[PDB]
Amino acid sequence: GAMGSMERASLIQKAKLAEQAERYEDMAAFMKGAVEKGEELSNEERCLLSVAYKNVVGGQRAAWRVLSSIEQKSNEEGSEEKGPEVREYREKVETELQGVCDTVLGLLDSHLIKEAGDAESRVFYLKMKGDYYRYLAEVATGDDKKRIIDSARSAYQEAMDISKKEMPPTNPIRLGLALNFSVFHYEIANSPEEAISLAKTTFDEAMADLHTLSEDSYKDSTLIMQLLRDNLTLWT
């Protein structure tokens, strides 16, 4: 690793600086170096890792969608043949996205998940595993497409099972997991009814538990609850 010679604490400090500078590729490389030191991550450090890669892959996905749209239009009836360039460049972006997802999944498998015993860490990492398989699924077309979808489903389902046993229904990680597993059902698994049921049940069970929270916890939980409602509004 090009980060092997840098102190763990200095990698963490630089990831925070890269975030303030909106340099998310650097942020991700610093956090990859920190993970590769081999020690478990704290709650704040897991946040830095997830923010960095979410921003990197989010930009890649937005670019891939622009390029896929152009490519689909070029394959319509009456379109002038522009040659292989649109497909090639969509493939270039796709391969770079797949590379980032494989990197994150590699960090989770070697060895973040196996050392994560507390619900707050284990659910967070298994949600991330479902998220990055989901991004692989968004671009998948080959023999392994169903297996990529099932890998996402399996990781999300293990996270859900732990979160229901070990976390209150307002826990922001539990809420965000349910938000994203619901989007998996709607966009990836062609299961809009399951997506809507999960978002609604998650919202209602959180609502009933808000009374237990402090003002600051209430703010955190209701922010994610509003994202569930936003999706329900989009889908109904």
Binding site: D131, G176, L179, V183, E187, I224, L227, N231, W235
Partner: peptide, 5 residues
């Protein structure tokens, strides 16, 4: 697109 976190 729908919201994720």
């Amino acid at each position: 697109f729908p919201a994720t976190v």
